[PDB]
């Protein structure tokens, strides 16, 4: 389904849909696994919103199980390159690479809803990649360089040292909203305005 709705004004009538309405309010939605296609969609949106008005903040709603590493660094870099500030908001969960995107919003403007959860863990490889020992040595180095790169951007945004991060993500670490606040990953826990 996903209904569309109609707004009106003396200038005319506008039909649109929830996501469009959100985008009109400078809200991006990252509610899927970060993959190549997704990363492109989000970058496209970041750059576009940055073009329309670079002095106004961009908000990213995050409800994601994470995604691929270079897709993560594609979005992370765009988020940092853009002029406009980025308010990050965790609705349901920000896990792995999602947790890094949550932490990477501009200081003071990173938040999460009270029952959200942040998972932090190190780069895994569910698949098997095969080759000569010479080819794998290269891969292992690249996987190690990726791992520590996650640790130092996480460190950069949580205020912690990469050594701590590296120790905490050795095994999965699940955080509640309040705990993610304590950890440095977000700044405030949203209170119900009802």
């Amino acid at each position: 389904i996903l209904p569309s709705f109609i707004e009106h004004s003396s200038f005319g009538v506008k039909e649109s849909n929830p996501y469009n309405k959100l985008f009109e309010e400078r809200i991006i939605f990252l509610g899927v696994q970060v993959d190549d296609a997704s990363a492109n969609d989000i970058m496209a949106q970041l750059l576009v919103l940055e073009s329309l008005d670079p002095d106004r903040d961009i908000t990213m709603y995050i409800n994601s199980p994470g995604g691929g590493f270079t897709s993560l660094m594609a979005i992370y870099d765009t988020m940092q390159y853009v002029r406009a500030d980025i308010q990050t908001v965790c609705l349901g969960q920000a896990a792995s690479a999602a947790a890094v995107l949550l932490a990477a919003g501009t200081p003071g403007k990173r938040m999460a809803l009270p029952n959200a959860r942040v998972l932090i863990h190190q780069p895994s490889l569910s698949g098997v990649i095969q080759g000569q020992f010479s080819d794998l040595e290269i891969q292992a180095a690249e996987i190690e360089r990726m791992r520590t790169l996650m640790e130092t951007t996480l460190a950069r945004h949580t205020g912690k040292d990469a050594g701590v991060i590296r120790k905490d993500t050795d095994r999965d670490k699940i955080l509640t909203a309040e705990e993610a606040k304590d950890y440095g990953i977000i700044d405030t826990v949203l209170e119900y305005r009802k």
């Binding site: 098997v128 095969q130 794998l136 040595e137 190690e144």
Partner: protein, 177 residues
């Protein structure tokens, strides 16, 4: 029955590594050497090899068993002795390593995969470097070639005809008979 001929050749103290080296052929092949040595610890065991290669661990089972045996193991390359086949071929008793005239030998570096978390792959990689090193140390020992040449020549598949394999050091003789 294929197995009747194989047991007849067993009494003749002939055994066959005729497939990819895996744990099942290795365990059969290690059992056979334990048997034959139990029967006569002074008569030689003939191992004919025709193999694409396979598991190093399976091959080290066989190789150590070959070496701890009381008797000599004569290795014969029929058709193809590749990778782990080549290793086991070169691992037979010095002077008693044979190549049939049209057999080919292949040597190259180890193959595998990585998988799992970054910390698990880090450990996998530690072993890649440990094992590779020891694999070259041993082939350099069988052939008489410097560990620098084994490493360099092993980087990508290098094939040897029977005559070339004898030059390099994989075998001591070429059977004309």
């Amino acid at each position: 029955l294929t197995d009747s001929v194989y047991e007849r050749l067993l009494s003749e103290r002939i055994i066959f590594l005729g497939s990819e080296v895996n744990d099942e052929i290795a365990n059969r092949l290690c059992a056979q050497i334990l048997l034959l040595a139990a029967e006569d610890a002074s008569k030689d065991i003939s191992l004919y090899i025709n193999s694409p290669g396979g598991s190093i661990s399976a091959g080290m089972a066989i190789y150590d068993t070959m070496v701890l045996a009381p008797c000599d193991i004569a290795t014969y390359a029929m058709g193809m002795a590749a990778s782990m086949g080549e290793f086991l071929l070169a691992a037979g008793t010095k002077g008693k390593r044979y190549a049939l005239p049209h057999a080919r030998i292949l040597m190259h570096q180890p193959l595998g995969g990585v998988t799992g978390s970054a910390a698990d792959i880090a450990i996998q990689a530690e072993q890649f470097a440990v094992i590779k090193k020891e694999m070259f140390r041993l082939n350099a020992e069988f052939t008489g070639q410097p560990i620098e040449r084994i490493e360099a020549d092993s980087d990508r598949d290098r094939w040897f005809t029977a005559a070339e394999a004898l030059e390099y050091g994989f075998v001591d003789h070429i059977i004309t008979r």
